[PDB]
Amino acid sequence: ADAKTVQDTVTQVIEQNMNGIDNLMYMSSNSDSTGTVQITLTFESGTDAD
Amino acid sequence: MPNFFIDRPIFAWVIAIIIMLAGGLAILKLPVAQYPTIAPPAVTISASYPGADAKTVQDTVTQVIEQNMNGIDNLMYMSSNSDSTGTVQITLTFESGTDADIAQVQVQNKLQLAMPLLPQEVQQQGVSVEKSSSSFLMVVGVINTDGTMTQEDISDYVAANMKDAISRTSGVGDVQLFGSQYAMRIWMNPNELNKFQLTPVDVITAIKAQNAQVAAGQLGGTPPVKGQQLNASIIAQTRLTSTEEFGKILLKVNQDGSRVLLRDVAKIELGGENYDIIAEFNGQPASGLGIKLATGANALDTAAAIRAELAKMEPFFPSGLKIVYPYDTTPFVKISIHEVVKTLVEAIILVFLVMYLFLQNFRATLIPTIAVPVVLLGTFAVLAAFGFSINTLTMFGMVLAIGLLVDDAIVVVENVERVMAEEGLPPKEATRKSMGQIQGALVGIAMVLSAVFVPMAFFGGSTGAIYRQFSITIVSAMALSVLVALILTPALCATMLKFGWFNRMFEKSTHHYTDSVGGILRSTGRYLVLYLIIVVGMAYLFVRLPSSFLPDEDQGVFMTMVQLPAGATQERTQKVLNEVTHYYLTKEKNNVESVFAVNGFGFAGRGQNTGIAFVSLKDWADRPGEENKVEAITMRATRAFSQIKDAMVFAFNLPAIVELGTATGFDFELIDQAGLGHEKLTQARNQLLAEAAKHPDMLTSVRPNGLEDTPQFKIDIDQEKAQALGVSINDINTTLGAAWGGSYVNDFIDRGRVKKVYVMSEAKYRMLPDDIGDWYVRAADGQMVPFSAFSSSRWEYGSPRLERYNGLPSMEILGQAAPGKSTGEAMELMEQLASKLPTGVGYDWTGMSYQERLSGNQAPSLYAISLIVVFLCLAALYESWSIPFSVMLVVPLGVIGALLAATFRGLTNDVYFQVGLLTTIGLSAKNAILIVEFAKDLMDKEGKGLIEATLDAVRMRLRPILMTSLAFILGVMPLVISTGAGSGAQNAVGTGVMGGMVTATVLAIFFVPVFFVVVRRRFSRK
Ligand SMILES: CN(C)c1ccc(O)c2c1C[C@H]1C[C@H]3[C@H](N(C)C)C(O)=C(C(N)=O)C(=O)[C@@]3(O)C(O)=C1C2=O
């Protein structure tokens, strides 16, 4: 699949659900053209990575 | 310290600044929230199996996943629900400090390995693990005010655009949709399609083929051949995106060239996902959004932030869809913390008035008006220092402690207007002497108050946290108070220090009194005997008084709870819901604001035959008469609703702490323990029940908290007869299923969003048993066959909701204490009634009634240590295994009168009372300690009289007592003891302190000097 067929199908669904996780600072994602997602959540300096 | 601090005065102005400035900085960091956390953590796993039923769902899913909940740390108990709506919910509760975040991982993780053993239809719906916490910050409604949009329509908009919009806003915790999100509804016709010799299977496997999504390579990319020049991505099949495209699905093509589209076999609207729960608000279609806390967010700040984002998207909003607000805690937390804070600003005016009209100044009164708002502000810092939060519990924490910390100021300052008047020295020099008779005695009233307080914060599980809530706050205020009374207060009043309707007038009243003490000091036992009558007072007053948890409160909303009988229907339940909704508007339009009524979700279960009506009221401002408040409206309504034929309809006020324990109730689980079946246990249940009723003396209201067996219609495929024709158990089942129950085929993309595609018989062909006929299945040779050909159906009784406790099948039983009896003894009878139930059956305690069992009585065991640690503490203040014993005897003096919230009102021994009670014992001993001290100072240092010192002691003390004590008994009763506006807890705290304060003073003044003399004389005599 390809961007508008993954960004729609996977990246949203996951992103919809990244609501309210302590010390969230900012999230960023990219779909692909080969079907490949990378959601990244960056947390506040200090926050426990585990 | 202080002596060598009233020399250094501007340093103790710094320390004042930090404390304050630090306390100010915390105010702007502190989480705000109605309550803090108090319920043990709990993880809920829930699943769907469309068209299921309690037994099926239970044996196919619930059992399975239960057999897997092992190797998870800190698990308290595990309960589960399997009900005929095709739904399971397993709820695992944890011990107390269990990290909520780790508890979910473990559960969720241990589930992930049971998944393989679940049925493909369920793995598909997905199973959810998530932290349960029925503490909602609010619930926006989204109605349509044109009638253009339906339930399902409105829900869809709400999902598409605003949902995430909210979910991302300034710390919201979780948003839940009160609706679907459109689903490609394919609504089959058995007849339209028995014609073309087709089943739902043929229909299903088409939807798969036509609505799939294929893959194929690129062009170059993967190793290409030399000097390629183009690289691009092939784009094969991809999902249908319209009701239109779905209509066109090659279902059949026969000799004729016949073209049988899905269109020609069913309706194809774009409806809701599940169709069995009907949300309307003031009579018209509605959808919702229930937002949650957010772990360290600001309840007021995100309350604002929601309304902002809702406004930042109020244009766009089609046709005419209002956003509405049937539930917001915020209002409550506001005009309840806007009070409290008033109590602080006010009980300040008081400790300037009952100070100036007594000392007479503008510079003596300006000192504790600089001291209080510091210890206070500074106390915030200490809260924030242990995570704590601005919240109802912690708020009244301080209010309920203001008297203890005003008395630390007043005491210091006026104990100089003593010293500088006899041998009258200057400021910088008399404060140096006064801060010497009291000095070490505050450092003892500190330790003393550290016990009789800290010993909370140590109580049981659930309700033990509420206690800590007050505990830390008070001990934090209290100790931070002494801390300024040694550092700022003296330094302060040894600087800035040196009406007529008094003075000479108090000057004589001291004398009339001081003499009364004398003489009541010669027999030395006319009053000692009087005391034993007071100690009996309280000791019998104790037992008499009913006990409670937290008194309910007008919160501005309440619930009507409607329940139709056994077989009743959705529509049939709607009719009822309406009357309810009708009654509330037309017949209560002077209190009722709205009726958000949900038709489908009930209490003891779900199903067409149950509902709830959330009703939200007008302002407190606009609901003035006590008969316009809640315990009024509900009382009327509950009666009013006795004109309904079959349809039990209650209305009750929700308890203060929503996500927490309840009535003096016990929670009883009747387990099974052997092969014993559903029925055997149903019988077993029926004994303990019927028995429990024979004893209304030990009181009761015992009751199954579950559902009774219903009839159900069993079809039954004849296996052989099936083989005989060309008919496959699979083709059979699917059809009967998907038609009657609905089946979820796959997904498609609707306006840039993945959404489900369901497939089931139009309602017309799936209602009555006589409707089975309609359905045909294509057999081996290819001839449509009728259901009667391979099956036969009898009616029979089953359970729409089978329940289990800790893996073994349970039936939970609710029940009430007794009008005279203790929650504890109602239990104790129950266990006995249980022990005689037919071999196999067992019981267990859960809920509050477990949080009770495993948290003994404690209070007597804990204060037994406080007490010991007071006598131990108090001896060392003086120097005697005797003298301290005089100070203690004050305990009961505050109790009586405090406990006389039986005679001046009808209330209950509750958490607020209990802490109010402690605040009072606090000033009581404080008095006693300063007295027994003043009597020991000028008796060991001045060698004065075995009785003469005790007369010169209660002389010097009588003035502080009166000042601070009037200060309290006024400002501890502004709207406190007399409210109705988010009140309840207000009257609760205050009343206990008022009457307790009255008796703790108008009585210790005579008794503590008696106490100091009655002791001493017993020791050194033998
Ligand atoms: C009881 N709850 C507060 C409400 C209130 C009003 C509502 O309008 C609704 C709910 C529950 C939710 C649950 C959701 C759930 N989820 C969003 C898929 C869900 O799994 C179901 C289900 N029972 O399978 C729904 O019926 C559901 O679609 C639904 O119809 C609801 C909705 O109609």
mmCIF file with all atom_site columns, N, CA and C and ligand atoms in Angstrom, chain B residues 47-49 85-87 125 136 139 151-152 155 176-181 272-280 286-288 596-602 606 612 614 756 758, ligand 1:
data_model
loop_
_atom_site.group_PDB
_atom_site.id
_atom_site.type_symbol
_atom_site.label_atom_id
_atom_site.label_alt_id
_atom_site.label_comp_id
_atom_site.label_asym_id
_atom_site.label_entity_id
_atom_site.label_seq_id
_atom_site.pdbx_PDB_ins_code
_atom_site.Cartn_x
_atom_site.Cartn_y
_atom_site.Cartn_z
_atom_site.occupancy
_atom_site.B_iso_or_equiv
_atom_site.pdbx_formal_charge
_atom_site.auth_seq_id
_atom_site.auth_comp_id
_atom_site.auth_asym_id
_atom_site.auth_atom_id
_atom_site.pdbx_PDB_model_num
ATOM   1   N N   . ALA B 1 47  ? -14.571 -7.633  25.611 1.00 0.00 ? 47  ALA B N   1
ATOM   2   C CA  . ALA B 1 47  ? -14.590 -8.211  24.266 1.00 0.00 ? 47  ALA B CA  1
ATOM   3   C C   . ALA B 1 47  ? -16.024 -8.358  23.742 1.00 0.00 ? 47  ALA B C   1
ATOM   4   N N   . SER B 1 48  ? -16.115 -8.471  22.408 1.00 0.00 ? 48  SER B N   1
ATOM   5   C CA  . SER B 1 48  ? -17.376 -8.713  21.723 1.00 0.00 ? 48  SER B CA  1
ATOM   6   C C   . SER B 1 48  ? -17.330 -9.988  20.929 1.00 0.00 ? 48  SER B C   1
ATOM   7   N N   . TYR B 1 49  ? -18.492 -10.617 20.758 1.00 0.00 ? 49  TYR B N   1
ATOM   8   C CA  . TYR B 1 49  ? -18.705 -11.791 19.944 1.00 0.00 ? 49  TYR B CA  1
ATOM   9   C C   . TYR B 1 49  ? -20.109 -11.600 19.385 1.00 0.00 ? 49  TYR B C   1
ATOM   10  N N   . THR B 1 85  ? -25.691 -10.337 25.297 1.00 0.00 ? 85  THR B N   1
ATOM   11  C CA  . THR B 1 85  ? -25.515 -9.332  24.275 1.00 0.00 ? 85  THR B CA  1
ATOM   12  C C   . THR B 1 85  ? -24.234 -9.566  23.502 1.00 0.00 ? 85  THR B C   1
ATOM   13  N N   . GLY B 1 86  ? -23.603 -10.704 23.755 1.00 0.00 ? 86  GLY B N   1
ATOM   14  C CA  . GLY B 1 86  ? -22.322 -11.032 23.171 1.00 0.00 ? 86  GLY B CA  1
ATOM   15  C C   . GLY B 1 86  ? -21.195 -10.227 23.767 1.00 0.00 ? 86  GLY B C   1
ATOM   16  N N   . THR B 1 87  ? -21.228 -9.927  25.060 1.00 0.00 ? 87  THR B N   1
ATOM   17  C CA  . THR B 1 87  ? -20.153 -9.117  25.642 1.00 0.00 ? 87  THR B CA  1
ATOM   18  C C   . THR B 1 87  ? -19.543 -9.699  26.899 1.00 0.00 ? 87  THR B C   1
ATOM   19  N N   . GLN B 1 125 ? -12.969 -8.421  16.458 1.00 0.00 ? 125 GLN B N   1
ATOM   20  C CA  . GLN B 1 125 ? -13.614 -7.272  17.097 1.00 0.00 ? 125 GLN B CA  1
ATOM   21  C C   . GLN B 1 125 ? -12.581 -6.562  17.912 1.00 0.00 ? 125 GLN B C   1
ATOM   22  N N   . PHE B 1 136 ? -15.572 10.712  35.547 1.00 0.00 ? 136 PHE B N   1
ATOM   23  C CA  . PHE B 1 136 ? -15.636 11.530  34.339 1.00 0.00 ? 136 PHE B CA  1
ATOM   24  C C   . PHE B 1 136 ? -15.498 13.014  34.626 1.00 0.00 ? 136 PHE B C   1
ATOM   25  N N   . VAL B 1 139 ? -19.154 15.353  30.082 1.00 0.00 ? 139 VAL B N   1
ATOM   26  C CA  . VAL B 1 139 ? -19.765 14.651  28.975 1.00 0.00 ? 139 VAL B CA  1
ATOM   27  C C   . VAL B 1 139 ? -20.486 15.659  28.114 1.00 0.00 ? 139 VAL B C   1
ATOM   28  N N   . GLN B 1 151 ? -29.271 9.771   15.409 1.00 0.00 ? 151 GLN B N   1
ATOM   29  C CA  . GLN B 1 151 ? -28.328 9.223   16.371 1.00 0.00 ? 151 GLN B CA  1
ATOM   30  C C   . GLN B 1 151 ? -27.024 8.970   15.656 1.00 0.00 ? 151 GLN B C   1
ATOM   31  N N   . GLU B 1 152 ? -27.066 8.054   14.693 1.00 0.00 ? 152 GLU B N   1
ATOM   32  C CA  . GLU B 1 152 ? -25.866 7.583   14.007 1.00 0.00 ? 152 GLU B CA  1
ATOM   33  C C   . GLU B 1 152 ? -25.134 8.673   13.246 1.00 0.00 ? 152 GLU B C   1
ATOM   34  N N   . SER B 1 155 ? -23.282 11.051  15.719 1.00 0.00 ? 155 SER B N   1
ATOM   35  C CA  . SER B 1 155 ? -22.108 10.337  16.232 1.00 0.00 ? 155 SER B CA  1
ATOM   36  C C   . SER B 1 155 ? -20.950 10.371  15.261 1.00 0.00 ? 155 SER B C   1
ATOM   37  N N   . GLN B 1 176 ? -14.411 9.181   25.310 1.00 0.00 ? 176 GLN B N   1
ATOM   38  C CA  . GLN B 1 176 ? -15.177 8.031   24.830 1.00 0.00 ? 176 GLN B CA  1
ATOM   39  C C   . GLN B 1 176 ? -16.323 8.465   23.942 1.00 0.00 ? 176 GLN B C   1
ATOM   40  N N   . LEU B 1 177 ? -16.515 7.775   22.823 1.00 0.00 ? 177 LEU B N   1
ATOM   41  C CA  . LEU B 1 177 ? -17.601 8.147   21.942 1.00 0.00 ? 177 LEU B CA  1
ATOM   42  C C   . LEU B 1 177 ? -18.919 7.524   22.376 1.00 0.00 ? 177 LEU B C   1
ATOM   43  N N   . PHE B 1 178 ? -19.945 8.363   22.442 1.00 0.00 ? 178 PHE B N   1
ATOM   44  C CA  . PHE B 1 178 ? -21.303 7.934   22.706 1.00 0.00 ? 178 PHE B CA  1
ATOM   45  C C   . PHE B 1 178 ? -21.995 7.632   21.376 1.00 0.00 ? 178 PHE B C   1
ATOM   46  N N   . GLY B 1 179 ? -21.407 6.682   20.648 1.00 0.00 ? 179 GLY B N   1
ATOM   47  C CA  . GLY B 1 179 ? -21.911 6.270   19.347 1.00 0.00 ? 179 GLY B CA  1
ATOM   48  C C   . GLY B 1 179 ? -20.917 5.513   18.491 1.00 0.00 ? 179 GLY B C   1
ATOM   49  N N   . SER B 1 180 ? -21.337 5.274   17.257 1.00 0.00 ? 180 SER B N   1
ATOM   50  C CA  . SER B 1 180 ? -20.648 4.426   16.296 1.00 0.00 ? 180 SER B CA  1
ATOM   51  C C   . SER B 1 180 ? -19.550 5.178   15.537 1.00 0.00 ? 180 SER B C   1
ATOM   52  N N   . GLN B 1 181 ? -19.761 5.362   14.241 1.00 0.00 ? 181 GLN B N   1
ATOM   53  C CA  . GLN B 1 181 ? -18.836 6.063   13.358 1.00 0.00 ? 181 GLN B CA  1
ATOM   54  C C   . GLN B 1 181 ? -19.126 5.569   11.941 1.00 0.00 ? 181 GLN B C   1
ATOM   55  N N   . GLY B 1 272 ? -25.137 2.991   11.580 1.00 0.00 ? 272 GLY B N   1
ATOM   56  C CA  . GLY B 1 272 ? -24.311 2.827   12.765 1.00 0.00 ? 272 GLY B CA  1
ATOM   57  C C   . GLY B 1 272 ? -23.687 1.447   12.873 1.00 0.00 ? 272 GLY B C   1
ATOM   58  N N   . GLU B 1 273 ? -22.705 1.314   13.768 1.00 0.00 ? 273 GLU B N   1
ATOM   59  C CA  . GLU B 1 273 ? -21.914 0.099   13.888 1.00 0.00 ? 273 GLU B CA  1
ATOM   60  C C   . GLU B 1 273 ? -22.727 -0.928  14.667 1.00 0.00 ? 273 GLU B C   1
ATOM   61  N N   . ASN B 1 274 ? -23.045 -0.613  15.913 1.00 0.00 ? 274 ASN B N   1
ATOM   62  C CA  . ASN B 1 274 ? -23.980 -1.389  16.691 1.00 0.00 ? 274 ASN B CA  1
ATOM   63  C C   . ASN B 1 274 ? -25.264 -0.567  16.699 1.00 0.00 ? 274 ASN B C   1
ATOM   64  N N   . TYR B 1 275 ? -26.421 -1.220  16.768 1.00 0.00 ? 275 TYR B N   1
ATOM   65  C CA  . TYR B 1 275 ? -27.706 -0.529  16.675 1.00 0.00 ? 275 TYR B CA  1
ATOM   66  C C   . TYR B 1 275 ? -28.601 -0.664  17.907 1.00 0.00 ? 275 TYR B C   1
ATOM   67  N N   . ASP B 1 276 ? -28.020 -1.003  19.046 1.00 0.00 ? 276 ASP B N   1
ATOM   68  C CA  . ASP B 1 276 ? -28.863 -1.407  20.154 1.00 0.00 ? 276 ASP B CA  1
ATOM   69  C C   . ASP B 1 276 ? -28.816 -0.530  21.442 1.00 0.00 ? 276 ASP B C   1
ATOM   70  N N   . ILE B 1 277 ? -28.544 0.757   21.267 1.00 0.00 ? 277 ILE B N   1
ATOM   71  C CA  . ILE B 1 277 ? -28.489 1.680   22.390 1.00 0.00 ? 277 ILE B CA  1
ATOM   72  C C   . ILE B 1 277 ? -28.802 3.093   21.870 1.00 0.00 ? 277 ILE B C   1
ATOM   73  N N   . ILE B 1 278 ? -29.910 3.646   22.355 1.00 0.00 ? 278 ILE B N   1
ATOM   74  C CA  . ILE B 1 278 ? -30.586 4.815   21.784 1.00 0.00 ? 278 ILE B CA  1
ATOM   75  C C   . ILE B 1 278 ? -30.370 6.066   22.636 1.00 0.00 ? 278 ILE B C   1
ATOM   76  N N   . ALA B 1 279 ? -29.473 6.927   22.183 1.00 0.00 ? 279 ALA B N   1
ATOM   77  C CA  . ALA B 1 279 ? -29.129 8.146   22.909 1.00 0.00 ? 279 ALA B CA  1
ATOM   78  C C   . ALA B 1 279 ? -29.978 9.310   22.453 1.00 0.00 ? 279 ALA B C   1
ATOM   79  N N   . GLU B 1 280 ? -30.819 9.801   23.358 1.00 0.00 ? 280 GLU B N   1
ATOM   80  C CA  . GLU B 1 280 ? -31.420 11.113  23.152 1.00 0.00 ? 280 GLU B CA  1
ATOM   81  C C   . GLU B 1 280 ? -31.407 12.021  24.371 1.00 0.00 ? 280 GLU B C   1
ATOM   82  N N   . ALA B 1 286 ? -29.146 12.390  19.969 1.00 0.00 ? 286 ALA B N   1
ATOM   83  C CA  . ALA B 1 286 ? -27.936 12.895  20.600 1.00 0.00 ? 286 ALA B CA  1
ATOM   84  C C   . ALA B 1 286 ? -26.783 11.923  20.529 1.00 0.00 ? 286 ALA B C   1
ATOM   85  N N   . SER B 1 287 ? -25.585 12.496  20.551 1.00 0.00 ? 287 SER B N   1
ATOM   86  C CA  . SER B 1 287 ? -24.335 11.765  20.701 1.00 0.00 ? 287 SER B CA  1
ATOM   87  C C   . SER B 1 287 ? -23.504 12.450  21.785 1.00 0.00 ? 287 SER B C   1
ATOM   88  N N   . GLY B 1 288 ? -22.494 11.756  22.288 1.00 0.00 ? 288 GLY B N   1
ATOM   89  C CA  . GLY B 1 288 ? -21.739 12.276  23.400 1.00 0.00 ? 288 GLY B CA  1
ATOM   90  C C   . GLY B 1 288 ? -20.233 12.174  23.294 1.00 0.00 ? 288 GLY B C   1
ATOM   91  N N   . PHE B 1 596 ? -30.792 13.816  29.438 1.00 0.00 ? 596 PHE B N   1
ATOM   92  C CA  . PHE B 1 596 ? -29.994 12.959  28.580 1.00 0.00 ? 596 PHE B CA  1
ATOM   93  C C   . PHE B 1 596 ? -30.287 11.525  28.982 1.00 0.00 ? 596 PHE B C   1
ATOM   94  N N   . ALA B 1 597 ? -31.108 10.835  28.189 1.00 0.00 ? 597 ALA B N   1
ATOM   95  C CA  . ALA B 1 597 ? -31.560 9.481   28.544 1.00 0.00 ? 597 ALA B CA  1
ATOM   96  C C   . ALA B 1 597 ? -31.012 8.462   27.575 1.00 0.00 ? 597 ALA B C   1
ATOM   97  N N   . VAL B 1 598 ? -30.355 7.436   28.111 1.00 0.00 ? 598 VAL B N   1
ATOM   98  C CA  . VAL B 1 598 ? -29.797 6.384   27.271 1.00 0.00 ? 598 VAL B CA  1
ATOM   99  C C   . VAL B 1 598 ? -30.621 5.119   27.419 1.00 0.00 ? 598 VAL B C   1
ATOM   100 N N   . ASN B 1 599 ? -31.120 4.635   26.288 1.00 0.00 ? 599 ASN B N   1
ATOM   101 C CA  . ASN B 1 599 ? -32.005 3.481   26.227 1.00 0.00 ? 599 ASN B CA  1
ATOM   102 C C   . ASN B 1 599 ? -31.257 2.236   25.785 1.00 0.00 ? 599 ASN B C   1
ATOM   103 N N   . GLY B 1 600 ? -30.809 1.438   26.740 1.00 0.00 ? 600 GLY B N   1
ATOM   104 C CA  . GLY B 1 600 ? -30.014 0.292   26.390 1.00 0.00 ? 600 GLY B CA  1
ATOM   105 C C   . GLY B 1 600 ? -29.032 -0.102  27.455 1.00 0.00 ? 600 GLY B C   1
ATOM   106 N N   . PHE B 1 601 ? -28.265 0.860   27.968 1.00 0.00 ? 601 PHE B N   1
ATOM   107 C CA  . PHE B 1 601 ? -27.329 0.602   29.075 1.00 0.00 ? 601 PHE B CA  1
ATOM   108 C C   . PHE B 1 601 ? -28.023 0.749   30.424 1.00 0.00 ? 601 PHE B C   1
ATOM   109 N N   . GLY B 1 602 ? -28.092 -0.334  31.186 1.00 0.00 ? 602 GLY B N   1
ATOM   110 C CA  . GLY B 1 602 ? -28.733 -0.289  32.484 1.00 0.00 ? 602 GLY B CA  1
ATOM   111 C C   . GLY B 1 602 ? -27.715 -0.491  33.585 1.00 0.00 ? 602 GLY B C   1
ATOM   112 N N   . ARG B 1 606 ? -27.297 -5.158  30.550 1.00 0.00 ? 606 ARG B N   1
ATOM   113 C CA  . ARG B 1 606 ? -27.637 -4.426  29.326 1.00 0.00 ? 606 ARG B CA  1
ATOM   114 C C   . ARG B 1 606 ? -28.779 -5.163  28.652 1.00 0.00 ? 606 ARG B C   1
ATOM   115 N N   . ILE B 1 612 ? -31.337 4.102   31.406 1.00 0.00 ? 612 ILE B N   1
ATOM   116 C CA  . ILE B 1 612 ? -31.017 5.053   32.427 1.00 0.00 ? 612 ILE B CA  1
ATOM   117 C C   . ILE B 1 612 ? -31.318 6.431   31.851 1.00 0.00 ? 612 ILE B C   1
ATOM   118 N N   . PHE B 1 614 ? -29.952 10.214  32.560 1.00 0.00 ? 614 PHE B N   1
ATOM   119 C CA  . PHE B 1 614 ? -29.078 11.199  33.224 1.00 0.00 ? 614 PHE B CA  1
ATOM   120 C C   . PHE B 1 614 ? -29.850 12.497  33.226 1.00 0.00 ? 614 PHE B C   1
ATOM   121 N N   . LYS B 1 756 ? -15.900 -0.085  9.468  1.00 0.00 ? 756 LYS B N   1
ATOM   122 C CA  . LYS B 1 756 ? -16.281 -1.478  9.305  1.00 0.00 ? 756 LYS B CA  1
ATOM   123 C C   . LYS B 1 756 ? -17.369 -1.656  8.230  1.00 0.00 ? 756 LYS B C   1
ATOM   124 N N   . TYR B 1 758 ? -20.574 -4.205  8.072  1.00 0.00 ? 758 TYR B N   1
ATOM   125 C CA  . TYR B 1 758 ? -21.347 -5.339  8.602  1.00 0.00 ? 758 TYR B CA  1
ATOM   126 C C   . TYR B 1 758 ? -22.323 -5.867  7.531  1.00 0.00 ? 758 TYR B C   1
HETATM 127 C C1  . LIG C 2 .   ? -23.471 3.752   27.603 1.00 0.00 ? 1   LIG C C1  1
HETATM 128 N N1  . LIG C 2 .   ? -22.592 4.752   26.970 1.00 0.00 ? 1   LIG C N1  1
HETATM 129 C C2  . LIG C 2 .   ? -22.419 5.871   27.912 1.00 0.00 ? 1   LIG C C2  1
HETATM 130 C C3  . LIG C 2 .   ? -23.130 5.205   25.741 1.00 0.00 ? 1   LIG C C3  1
HETATM 131 C C4  . LIG C 2 .   ? -24.010 6.290   25.756 1.00 0.00 ? 1   LIG C C4  1
HETATM 132 C C5  . LIG C 2 .   ? -24.562 6.768   24.579 1.00 0.00 ? 1   LIG C C5  1
HETATM 133 C C6  . LIG C 2 .   ? -24.239 6.158   23.377 1.00 0.00 ? 1   LIG C C6  1
HETATM 134 O O1  . LIG C 2 .   ? -24.807 6.662   22.247 1.00 0.00 ? 1   LIG C O1  1
HETATM 135 C C7  . LIG C 2 .   ? -23.362 5.068   23.338 1.00 0.00 ? 1   LIG C C7  1
HETATM 136 C C8  . LIG C 2 .   ? -22.791 4.589   24.530 1.00 0.00 ? 1   LIG C C8  1
HETATM 137 C C9  . LIG C 2 .   ? -21.827 3.403   24.534 1.00 0.00 ? 1   LIG C C9  1
HETATM 138 C C10 . LIG C 2 .   ? -21.096 3.251   23.198 1.00 0.00 ? 1   LIG C C10 1
HETATM 139 C C11 . LIG C 2 .   ? -20.233 1.988   23.152 1.00 0.00 ? 1   LIG C C11 1
HETATM 140 C C12 . LIG C 2 .   ? -19.741 1.746   21.720 1.00 0.00 ? 1   LIG C C12 1
HETATM 141 C C13 . LIG C 2 .   ? -18.582 0.729   21.659 1.00 0.00 ? 1   LIG C C13 1
HETATM 142 N N2  . LIG C 2 .   ? -17.466 1.105   20.712 1.00 0.00 ? 1   LIG C N2  1
HETATM 143 C C14 . LIG C 2 .   ? -17.393 2.553   20.422 1.00 0.00 ? 1   LIG C C14 1
HETATM 144 C C15 . LIG C 2 .   ? -17.454 0.372   19.426 1.00 0.00 ? 1   LIG C C15 1
HETATM 145 C C16 . LIG C 2 .   ? -19.061 -0.716  21.505 1.00 0.00 ? 1   LIG C C16 1
HETATM 146 O O2  . LIG C 2 .   ? -18.141 -1.686  21.481 1.00 0.00 ? 1   LIG C O2  1
HETATM 147 C C17 . LIG C 2 .   ? -20.365 -1.061  21.413 1.00 0.00 ? 1   LIG C C17 1
HETATM 148 C C18 . LIG C 2 .   ? -20.780 -2.467  21.622 1.00 0.00 ? 1   LIG C C18 1
HETATM 149 N N3  . LIG C 2 .   ? -21.694 -2.709  22.569 1.00 0.00 ? 1   LIG C N3  1
HETATM 150 O O3  . LIG C 2 .   ? -20.295 -3.368  20.947 1.00 0.00 ? 1   LIG C O3  1
HETATM 151 C C19 . LIG C 2 .   ? -21.379 -0.035  21.103 1.00 0.00 ? 1   LIG C C19 1
HETATM 152 O O4  . LIG C 2 .   ? -22.570 -0.322  21.059 1.00 0.00 ? 1   LIG C O4  1
HETATM 153 C C20 . LIG C 2 .   ? -20.941 1.391   20.841 1.00 0.00 ? 1   LIG C C20 1
HETATM 154 O O5  . LIG C 2 .   ? -20.561 1.514   19.466 1.00 0.00 ? 1   LIG C O5  1
HETATM 155 C C21 . LIG C 2 .   ? -22.111 2.325   21.111 1.00 0.00 ? 1   LIG C C21 1
HETATM 156 O O6  . LIG C 2 .   ? -23.193 2.167   20.353 1.00 0.00 ? 1   LIG C O6  1
HETATM 157 C C22 . LIG C 2 .   ? -22.089 3.281   22.062 1.00 0.00 ? 1   LIG C C22 1
HETATM 158 C C23 . LIG C 2 .   ? -23.035 4.464   22.005 1.00 0.00 ? 1   LIG C C23 1
HETATM 159 O O7  . LIG C 2 .   ? -24.229 4.181   21.261 1.00 0.00 ? 1   LIG C O7  1
#
